[PDB]
Write a protein that binds this DNA or RNA. Structure first.
Ligand SMILES: [Mg+2]
Ligand SMILES: [Mg+2]
Ligand SMILES: [Mg+2]
Ligand SMILES: [Mg+2]
Ligand SMILES: [Mg+2]
Ligand SMILES: [Mg+2]
Ligand SMILES: [Mg+2]
Ligand SMILES: [Mg+2]
Ligand SMILES: [Mg+2]
Ligand SMILES: [Mg+2]
Ligand SMILES: [Mg+2]
Ligand SMILES: [Mg+2]
Ligand SMILES: [Mg+2]
Ligand SMILES: [Mg+2]
Ligand SMILES: [Mg+2]
Ligand SMILES: [Mg+2]
Ligand SMILES: [Mg+2]
Ligand SMILES: [Mg+2]
Ligand SMILES: [Mg+2]
Ligand SMILES: [Mg+2]
Ligand SMILES: [Mg+2]
Ligand SMILES: [Mg+2]
Ligand SMILES: [Mg+2]
Ligand SMILES: [Mg+2]
Ligand SMILES: [Mg+2]
Ligand SMILES: [Mg+2]
Ligand SMILES: [Mg+2]
Ligand SMILES: [Mg+2]
Ligand SMILES: [Mg+2]
Ligand SMILES: [Mg+2]
Ligand SMILES: [Mg+2]
Ligand SMILES: [Mg+2]
Ligand SMILES: [Mg+2]
Ligand SMILES: [Mg+2]
Ligand SMILES: [Mg+2]
Ligand SMILES: [Mg+2]
Ligand SMILES: [Mg+2]
Ligand SMILES: [Mg+2]
Lengths: 119, 170, 46, 172, 203, 48, 116
RNA sequence: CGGUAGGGGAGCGUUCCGUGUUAGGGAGAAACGCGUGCGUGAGCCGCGUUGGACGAAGCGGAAGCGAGAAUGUCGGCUUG
RNA sequence: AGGGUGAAAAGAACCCCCAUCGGGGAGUGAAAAGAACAUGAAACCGUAAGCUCUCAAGCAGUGGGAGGGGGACCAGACC
C-alpha cells in the first residue's frame, strides 16, 4: 500500500516556522536554516535561564554596595553583610536591593540598627 | 433605518452628500452646556480616584523566597501543598514591616506578626522549554516543563504593633 | 637556542593560578551562631 | 462597507512583454501622481515600458469616466504594482558545447485609480470640527448615522482608527 | 512650510487628544527622592516590588544630572581616573544600571598639573598607529603634556569606561580643560568626593 | 572571479533601488520638457 | 586626453567622417532643411558655412573648390546662383539648429538643421 | 536520574483493511489557515468572512510508514 | 513531456478604452469558476499599514527592556 508522505512533513515544518518568526533575514524564511536557528534559540534560552539567576545576584549586590557606601566613610558591602549576619537578620539580596531603591530611608534605618547593636 | 437609508442613498446615488446623512436639524450642543458635558464625560471619562489600602508592607518568606507584599494585591508562589481554592492562610515568617510612620525590623523575625492571605488559585506556569543539546554528538532532547504554582491574595498584615519600632528621627 | 617552549596543556599546567601562601589556603567559611527556631512557613486557618 | 468600493477603479494589464524590473522603473514614478501629470510624463519618458503603461493608464481613465462616472481631473494613481508573469524559456548554444537559458519575462500590471473629491462632503465637514466638537456631534446620532458619517477616508488620513474604537464610538 | 490647512490642524488636534487620554490613565511618575514604597496609584499597577527595578525614561533625562569638578593639580593620574570612571558610569548610585546612563558629568581642570609617579614622565609611552605599515608614532608622556595635555586624561579615562555603544556615549560626559577655568558655571558644579588615601601626592 | 556567496535579499533590494532612482531624474526632465512644449513659445524646440 | 582638440568625431574614422559630412551638406543644399542627430548637425555647421562663404566670392577658383566637396554639380551651380542674392548681407551664421523629440529605436537625441 | 558507539523499555504519527453501506457531513467533509487550549515529546483537542464532497473516535490488523544532508534525484525559483 | 471551467458552453450580446491582444461594465451561471479557467503549500517577486536603523563591528539569537503602537476581558495580562 503506497504512502505519499503528504502533510506530515509540512505540518512539522510549519510548527517550526512559527517559532522562528521575527528572525532577521533568511533565518525567518528557509526551512533548513530555520531548523538550526530554532535549536540555537532554544539552547540559549536554556543557558540563560541559568545565567539569569547569576546576573541578578550580580546586580543586586552591586546596587547594595552603592546604597551603603554613602553612609560611613569606611563602610562596604562586605562589612554590611557580615554585620547583617552577626545580628541575625534573614533579608536576602533582592529585598535589600529593592528596598535600597524604592524605600531608601528604610535602608538607612537598618544600617542604624546594625550600628546601634555593634555599639 | 438611517443606516438602511444612508446606505441605499450612498448606493443608488453615487457621490454622497452631507445634508442627507446629517440633516440640518442638528446644531450640536453648545460647548459650555450640561448636555455637551454629559456626552463628553461619557466618551472621554476622567481617571477615577484610586481605591483605599492600608499604607503598609511586609517582607515575607514563602517557599524560601522573600516577597514584598502590599495588601490587596495578589502574588505568585510555589505550590502550597494541600491548599485549596478559597482558603484562608497565615504566613508566619515575617522579616520586615514598613509603615510610612515607622519600620519594624525582625531579629530574624517580627514576633507575633502574621500575614492573612487567601488562596485564590492553583495554576501551572507558562511552559518552559528545557532543551539539551550537544553539537555533532547527534543528541538533542526536547523537554517541556510546566511548574505548578499557587496564586494567593494578601488581605492584611497584623500583630506587629507591640514589637519595638525604629524610625529615622532628625 | 637549546631550550623549548610550553605548548598547550604543558603551558596550562605552568600558568594556572594558585594560592601558594600558606595562610590563604587554610582559610574558611565564617562561623555564625545558630538561628533560633523559626515558625511554620505557612499555616491553614479555618 | 469600505472606501475600496467607492473611490476605486482597478485595471489589470496582462502579459505585457516588459520585464518586471524595467516596468517597475516607470511605475515607481507615477505612483501617487495626478492623472494629468502622469499622462505628460509617460508621453515624454525615454523608456520603452512607458508606452504600454501609458495605454493602460489611459484605458483605466476611460473606465473611471464611462463606467463608475468619475471626473478625469480628480483622478490620481493611488496604488500601482507590477507582478511577474509567465516566463518563456529558450535554450541557446554557447562556446564548446555548453548551453544557456534565455528567459523572456512578462508581467501583469495593476493600476488603481482613486477619485479624491468623492467623500469630500464628509471630509471637509469633519475637518471643520475640533476633536471635542466632533465627539459631541456624534453623541446624538444612531449607530447607523455614526457608521455612515465616519465611513469616509477620514479615520485613516488623520490616524484616528484605533482611537475611536477605544472611545466606545463604534462596534466591530 | 507648515500647512495651516484644516487637515493638518485637525491631525495635530486629534493627536493632542490621544496624548491627553493616554496621560490621564497612565501611572504617574514619582521621582526617586525620599520616595516611599508606594503611591495608592501604583498599587493598581504592574509588579515592581517583586521584580528588579529598572529605570524608566523620566529618571535618566540628561538635564537632571549632577556636575562635578576635579582639580587635577597634584592628583595622581590613574587613581583619579578610577574615581572619575566610577562617577561617570553611575556605579555610586543605588539606582545603577549597566544598561543605562545614570551617571554624572565630570569636569577636569588644570590638566597639565596632573601628577605621575616614578620616571613615568619620561618613560610612559603613548603610541598611535596610522594603519599603513611603519605607521607607528610614539610620544613620551611629557612631549604630549607640552603639546596637547588634555589628551592624557581623556585617554586615561577612556580606558576605564566600558567599551561599545554605551561606553562611547558615556565618554562624552567627560569635559576636560587645560586651564584653571571652565565655562560651565551655569551647570553649578559640585566638587568630586575622593575616598582614596593615596590619591593626593605631596612633595 | 566568482561570487563566493549569494547576495542577501535586502542588499540586492537596495542596489536595484539605486538603479530605479535614475527613472526619477528622467521623470523630472520629462516633466520639465512637457511644461516647456505646453506653452508653444520655444523656437529652439519643434514637435510635429 | 584632449585639451583643445576641436574636431567632431561623430564616432567614425577619418575617411568615413569626411564622406559623411560632404554627403550631409549636399543634402542640406538640395532640400534646404533636414532631420539628423544632434552631433551630426553641430559638426556639420562648419562645412555648410565653408560652402556658403565659398559661393559668396564666386571665382572660378572657389567654384572648383566647392565642386570638389559637394557631390552633385547641379547643387553647386544653383548655390553660386542663389547665394549672392539670398545671403549677401548676412555676415556668417547661415544655419539654424532646432532640436526635437529623440528617436524611438535608440533614443538618440535628434535635431533639425535649417538653411537660414 | 551527563553521555558517543551501542543494548533495553514505553510511546506518537502516516496510508490502507476489519467493525462499516459506521457516528458525523452543501445547517460545509477532507484539506488549508489559525490558537492567551492540553501534553515529557512525537503530537492531540478546539476554531475559522478559506475550501466544495467525503469520512472520524474507540478496539484491532498490514505496510511502498516519518528526510536536512547521499558532488543524491526531478521540477520550480533565485544569486551573480 | 503536456490530465481535472461548469451540472449544462449556457464560452460572455451590447457600450466604453480600442490597430489586435488585453481590459472595465452589462448579460449567463449556485459561484467569474472567464477559457494560461477546480483545492492552490514553500521558495521567489512585490504593495499597503504599525514600530524602527545613517559613530557602526555583527553565525544575528537569547535573558534583561527604555520608548512607541495594537486587538482585550480576568483590564497587574496578551501581541
Ligand atoms: Mg493511496
Ligand atoms: Mg517516502
Ligand atoms: Mg522579539
Ligand atoms: Mg556522531
Ligand atoms: Mg626555540
Ligand atoms: Mg594562557
Ligand atoms: Mg579558598
Ligand atoms: Mg558546435
Ligand atoms: Mg553558458
Ligand atoms: Mg583610405
Ligand atoms: Mg574605409
Ligand atoms: Mg574656420
Ligand atoms: Mg547526576
Ligand atoms: Mg541518561
Ligand atoms: Mg545511542
Ligand atoms: Mg489520527
Ligand atoms: Mg487516513
Ligand atoms: Mg450515513
Ligand atoms: Mg472542519
Ligand atoms: Mg483521506
Ligand atoms: Mg488534529
Ligand atoms: Mg487519536
Ligand atoms: Mg458537489
Ligand atoms: Mg476506524
Ligand atoms: Mg487524519
Ligand atoms: Mg520503498
Ligand atoms: Mg531537498
Ligand atoms: Mg554545485
Ligand atoms: Mg535543480
Ligand atoms: Mg468582456
Ligand atoms: Mg495596423
Ligand atoms: Mg477582448
Ligand atoms: Mg456582471
Ligand atoms: Mg445572475
Ligand atoms: Mg487554481
Ligand atoms: Mg567616535
Ligand atoms: Mg545613531
Ligand atoms: Mg551594527
Amino acid at each position: 500500500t503506497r504512502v505519499k508522505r503528504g502533510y506530515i512533513a509540512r505540518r512539522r515544518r510549519k510548527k517550526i516556522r512559527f517559532f522562528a518568526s521575527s528572525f532577521r533575514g533568511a533565518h525567518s524564511r528557509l526551512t533548513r536554516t530555520i531548523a538550526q536557528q530554532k535549536i540555537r534559540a532554544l539552547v540559549s534560552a536554556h543557558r540563560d535561564r541559568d545565567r539569569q539567576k547569576r546576573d541578578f545576584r550580580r546586580l543586586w549586590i552591586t546596587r547594595i554596595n552603592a546604597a551603603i557606601r554613602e553612609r560611613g566613610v569606611y563602610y562596604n558591602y562586605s562589612k554590611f553583610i557580615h554585620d547583617l549576619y552577626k545580628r541575625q537578620l534573614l533579608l536576602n539580596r533582592k529585598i535589600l536591593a529593592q528596598i535600597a531603591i524604592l524605600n531608601p530611608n528604610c535602608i538607612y534605618m537598618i544600617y542604624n540598627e546594625i550600628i546601634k547593636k555593634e555599639d | 433605518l438611517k443606516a438602511e437609508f444612508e446606505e441605499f442613498q450612498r448606493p443608488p446615488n453615487q457621490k454622497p452628500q452631507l445634508s442627507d446623512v446629517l440633516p440640518d436639524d442638528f446644531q450640536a450642543p453648545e460647548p459650555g452646556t450640561p448636555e455637551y458635558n454629559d456626552i463628553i464625560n461619557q466618551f472621554l471619562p476622567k481617571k477615577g480616584p484610586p481605591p483605599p489600602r492600608e499604607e503598609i508592607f511586609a517582607v515575607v518568606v514563602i517557599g524560601s523566597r522573600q516577597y514584598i507584599v502590599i495588601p490587596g494585591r495578589w502574588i505568585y508562589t510555589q505550590r502550597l501543598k494541600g491548599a485549596t481554592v478559597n482558603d484562608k492562610i497565615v504566613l508566619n515568617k515575617v522579616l520586615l514591616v514598613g509603615t510610612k510612620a515607622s519600620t519594624y525590623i525582625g531579629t530574624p523575625i517580627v514576633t507575633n506578626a502574621a500575614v492573612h492571605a487567601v488562596v485564590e488559585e492553583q495554576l501551572l506556569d507558562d511552559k518552559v522549554i528545557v532543551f539539551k543539546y550537544k553539537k555533532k554528538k547527534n543528541y538533542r532532547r526536547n523537554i517541556g516543563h510546566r511548574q505548578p504554582i499557587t496564586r494567593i491574595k494578601i488581605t492584611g498584615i497584623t500583630g506587629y504593633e507591640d514589637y519595638p519600632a525604629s524610625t529615622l528621627e532628625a | 637556542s637549546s631550550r623549548p617552549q610550553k605548548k598547550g596543556t604543558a603551558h596550562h599546567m605552568k600558568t594556572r593560578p594558585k594560592k601558594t601562601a600558606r595562610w590563604d589556603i587554610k582559610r574558611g567559611p565564617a562561623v555564625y551562631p545558630p538561628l533560633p527556631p523559626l515558625p511554620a512557613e505557612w499555616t491553614i486557618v479555618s | 462597507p469600505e472606501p475600496g468600493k467607492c473611490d476605486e477603479i482597478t485595471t489589470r494589464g496582462y502579459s505585457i512583454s516588459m520585464s518586471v524590473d524595467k516596468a517597475r522603473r516607470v511605475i515607481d514614478q507615477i505612483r501617487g501622481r495626478s492623472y494629468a501629470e502622469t499622462l505628460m510624463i509617460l508621453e515624454l519618458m525615454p523608456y520603452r515600458a512607458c508606452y504600454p503603461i501609458f495605454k493602460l493608464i489611459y484605458s483605466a481613465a476611460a473606465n473611471a469616466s464611462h463606467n463608475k462616472q468619475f471626473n478625469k481631473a480628480n483622478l490620481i494613481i493611488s496604488k500601482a504594482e507590477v507582478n511577474k508573469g509567465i516566463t518563456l524559456k529558450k535554450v541557446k548554444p554557447r562556446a564548446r558545447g555548453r548551453s544557456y537559458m534565455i528567459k523572456r519575462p512578462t508581467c501583469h500590471i495593476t493600476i488603481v485609480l482613486r477619485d479624491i473629491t468623492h467623500f469630500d462632503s464628509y471630509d471637509k465637514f469633519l475637518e471643520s470640527l475640533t476633536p471635542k466638537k466632533l465627539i459631541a456631534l456624534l453623541g446624538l446620532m444612531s449607530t447607523g448615522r455614526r457608521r455612515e458619517l465616519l465611513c469616509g477616508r477620514f479615520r485613516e488620513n488623520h490616524k484616528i482608527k484605533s482611537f475611536l474604537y477605544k472611545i466606545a464610538l463604534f462596534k466591530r | 512650510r507648515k500647512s495651516t490647512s484644516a487637515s493638518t490642524k485637525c491631525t495635530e488636534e486629534w493627536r493632542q487628544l490621544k496624548e491627553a487620554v493616554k496621560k490621564e490613565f497612565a501611572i504617574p511618575h514619582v521621582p526617586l527622592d525620599q520616595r516611599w514604597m508606594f503611591t495608592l496609584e501604583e498599587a493598581t499597577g504592574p509588579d515592581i516590588w517583586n521584580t528588579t527595578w529598572y529605570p524608566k525614561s523620566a529618571d535618566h533625562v540628561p538635564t537632571d544630572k549632577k556636575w562635578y569638578v576635579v582639580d587635577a593639580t597634584d592628583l595622581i593620574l590613574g587613581r583619579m581616573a578610577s574615581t572619575i570612571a566610577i562617577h561617570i558610569r553611575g556605579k555610586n548610585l543605588a539606582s545603577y544600571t549597566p544598561s543605562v546612563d545614570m551617571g554624572a558629568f565630570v569636569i577636569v581642570v588644570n590638566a597639565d598639573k596632573v601628577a605621575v609617579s616614578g620616571k613615568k614622565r619620561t618613560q610612559k609611552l603613548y603610541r598611535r598607529h596610522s594603519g599603513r605599515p611603519g605607521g607607528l608614532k610614539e610620544e613620551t608622556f611629557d612631549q604630549l603634556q607640552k603639546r596637547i595635555p588634555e589628551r592624557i586624561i581623556e585617554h586615561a579615562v577612556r580606558g576605564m569606561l566600558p567599551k561599545g555603544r554605551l561606553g562611547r556615549y558615556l565618554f562624552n560626559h567627560l569635559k576636560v580643560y587645560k586651564g584653571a577655568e571652565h565655562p560651565h558655571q551655569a551647570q553649578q558644579p559640585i566638587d568630586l568626593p575622593l575616598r582614596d588615601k593615596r590619591i593626593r601626592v605631596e612633595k | 572571479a566568482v561570487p563566493k556567496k549569494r547576495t542577501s535579499i535586502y542588499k540586492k533590494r537596495i542596489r536595484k533601488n539605486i538603479w530605479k532612482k535614475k527613472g526619477y531624474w528622467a521623470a523630472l526632465k520629462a516633466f520639465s520638457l512637457a511644461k516647456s512644449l505646453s506653452t508653444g513659445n520655444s523656437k529652439s524646440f519643434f514637435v510635429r | 586626453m584632449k585639451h583643445g582638440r576641436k574636431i567632431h568625431r561623430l564616432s567614425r574614422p577619418a575617411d568615413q567622417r569626411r564622406a559623411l559630412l560632404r554627403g550631409l551638406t549636399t543634402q542640406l543644399l538640395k532640400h534646404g532643411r533636414i532631420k539628423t542627430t544632434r552631433a551630426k548637425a553641430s559638426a556639420m555647421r562648419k562645412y555648410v558655412d565653408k560652402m556658403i562663404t565659398l559661393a559668396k566670392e564666386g571665382s572660378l577658383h572657389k567654384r572648383r573648390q566647392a565642386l570638389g566637396f559637394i557631390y552633385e554639380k547641379q547643387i553647386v551651380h544653383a548655390l553660386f546662383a542663389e547665394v549672392p542674392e539670398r545671403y549677401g548681407d548676412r555676415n556668417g551664421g547661415y544655419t539654424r539648429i532646432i532640436r526635437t523629440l529623440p528617436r524611438r529605436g535608440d533614443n538618440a537625441p535628434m535635431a533639425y538643421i535649417e538653411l537660414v
